[PDB]
Enzyme design. Structure first.
Site, PDB file in Angstrom:
ATOM      1  CG  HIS A   1      -0.696   0.306   2.287  1.00  0.00           C
ATOM      2  ND1 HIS A   1      -0.419  -0.627   3.288  1.00  0.00           N
ATOM      3  CD2 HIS A   1      -0.518   1.521   3.001  1.00  0.00           C
ATOM      4  CE1 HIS A   1      -0.280  -0.264   4.504  1.00  0.00           C
ATOM      5  NE2 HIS A   1      -0.128   0.862   4.191  1.00  0.00           N
TER       6      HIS A   1
ATOM      7  N   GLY B   1       2.561   6.272   9.095  1.00  0.00           N
ATOM      8  CA  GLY B   1       3.382   6.460   9.065  1.00  0.00           C
ATOM      9  C   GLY B   1       4.506   5.021   9.991  1.00  0.00           C
TER      10      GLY B   1
ATOM     11  CB  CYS C   1       2.314   1.190   7.592  1.00  0.00           C
ATOM     12  SG  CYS C   1       0.798   1.533   7.730  1.00  0.00           S
TER      13      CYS C   1
END
Ligand SMILES: c1cnc(N2CC[C@]3(CCOC3)C2)cn1
Ligand SMILES: c1cnc(N2CC[C@]3(CCOC3)C2)cn1
Lengths: 304, 304
Positions: A41, A143, A145
């Site tokens: 993603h 942020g 991830c």
């Protein structure tokens, strides 16, 4: 003496964290050998996350669209591929700090350490468990991830988790390092409700052993039970069924303490039925289930 | 979202841990520049610990009696001195992994990370607070002495604690890195009882702000209070008195949430008087006091 929620030392994992940016999306990557692993993603806008077609979005991306920064030095991306829900960015430089590592897919009830990171920089380390509903209860802001979960066996890091998502209920979902989600979750901003967050019974029992080893003994009672009787009570209280395999795993703690596993189950049964009555065990007012039997042995024995 | 008991990433401190052996006693040392810091009780037998005369025991010790091992490489000891309750072993090699560092003496209620070590090898990392009675509730086995407590401000490690002792009640005592014990404790195996372990009120309030930020709101009530009224209740429940200085420190969390500090005190007062009624806040059944207001801001903002 004393018993703490303890994470693995994080330095070996700190040495692997990088920043990955694709367009306006920045998150964290894991740099092992000459591959950087990150959530796929990274290629999405928040708009994209509502119904992303990852293969289609990835066609519009070139190696040079993936900006990978290790500290304040840029890494050169020489290839990329999607594996399940992770991207693998091949870089031209092996991470010189690559530890001995494995990728492992853990089972619900297994614990691990998370190194929470932002912009490739470590912010903190804490201990998680894979919940029985395949969520984790983390601490992750926008942020974070690509932050990872791991265990260490002496000098070998077993990476078991990469952070991808927060459910609308504020629990967390992610993948193993092959990019397969734990549980039924998907990397899409859609209705994803978690199932029952049952208590990890074998871990509670491990922690009650830890409590006895550390002098917290008030809850030890005069009773025993059977697995089947215990399991009737477990079911009522949304505890995981205890199996003979769990009893076998608690054998060393039983031996050390001289408290038979089924006697500790009967103590746990009384705690479930009676509550704590305003008392604490190892500084907790609830029964803690994010220590595995192996964690208890490790912490009680001083393993490095 | 989510709120975890989070330690600082430990890698910068891992790079400083060494093994110190004097005769048959092995514990941990901290290697910064060309000095290794360790508990002075490394020179004691368990017999010695009953009534040690450290100056007299140290006369019988030479540089070559202090064996310092960094990984599996021996460091050459070229001088030693005692400073309060620590030894400083001058070595002929600056630690190449020395981070930016300071030595700080913290106040009760301040939190820090501990890197628990055995034989110079890191075993785990957890978050501690300096209790109001100047003990800490750690996880330390025989061999963990010389393990350190620290905070990080970006790239600077502030070392605030070195482990020395376990009290007969299984709580922990140690020194700052100048070798001064926190509290009234001494490095002798004698009757040392801790005072009242009061709850760190300002930290509880910080954590209740953290709970609101993270959607745990059930405990917010319709009341306010005054510092003096609140403090009458705090005293009754063995909470630290709240000062205007604490109210000022909670100002940013008050601002962020729009809950006036004295309104949160009134919510805490009701929790103290009513209990939790079987409910939880941020997964806790008791009021957590080992997050400072700075910790809450840091974790809620993603500081690296
Ligand atoms: C410079 C800095 N670190 C390096 N490392 C090599 C592999 C580790 C991680 C596992 O053990 C040590 C780190 C190399 N060069
Ligand atoms: C090899 C391995 N590590 C080295 N370091 C220098 C100082 C740190 C700690 C703070 O930043 C980096 C570690 C040097 N050489």
């Amino acid at each position: 003496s004393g018993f703490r929620k303890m994470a693995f030392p994080s330095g070996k994992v700190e040495g692997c964290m990088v920043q990955v940016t694709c367009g306006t999306t920045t998150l964290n990557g894991l740099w092992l050998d000459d591959v950087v692993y990150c959530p796929r993603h990274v290629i999405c806008t928040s708009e994209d996350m509502l119904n992303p077609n990852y293969e289609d979005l990835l066609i519009r991306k070139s190696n040079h669209n993936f900006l990978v920064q290790a500290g304040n030095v840029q890494l050169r991306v020489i290839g990329h591929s999607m594996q399940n829900c992770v991207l693998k960015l091949k870089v031209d430089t092996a991470n010189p700090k690559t530890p001995k590592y494995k990728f492992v897919r853990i089972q619900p009830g297994q614990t691990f350490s998370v190194l929470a990171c932002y912009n490739g920089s470590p912010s903190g380390v804490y201990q998680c468990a894979m919940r029985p509903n395949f969520t984790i209860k983390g601490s992750f802001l926008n942020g974070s991830c690509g932050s990872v979960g791991f265990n260490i066996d002496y000098d070998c890091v077993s990476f078991c988790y990469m952070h991808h998502m927060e459910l609308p209920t504020g629990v967390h979902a992610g993948t193993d390092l092959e990019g397969n989600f734990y549980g039924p979750f998907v990397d899409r901003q859609t209705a994803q409700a978690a199932g029952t967050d049952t208590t990890i019974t074998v871990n509670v029992l491990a922690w009650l052993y830890a409590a006895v080893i550390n002098g917290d003994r008030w809850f030890l009672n005069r009773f025993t039970t059977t697995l089947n009787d215990f399991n009737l009570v477990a079911m009522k209280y949304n505890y995981e069924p205890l199996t003979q395999d769990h009893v076998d795993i608690l054998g060393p703690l039983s031996a050390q303490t001289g408290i038979a596993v089924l006697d500790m189950c009967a103590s746990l049964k009384e705690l479930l039925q009676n509550g704590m009555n305003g008392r604490t065990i190892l500084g907790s007012a609830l029964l803690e289930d994010e220590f595995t039997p192996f964690d208890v042995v490790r912490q009680c024995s001083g393993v490095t």
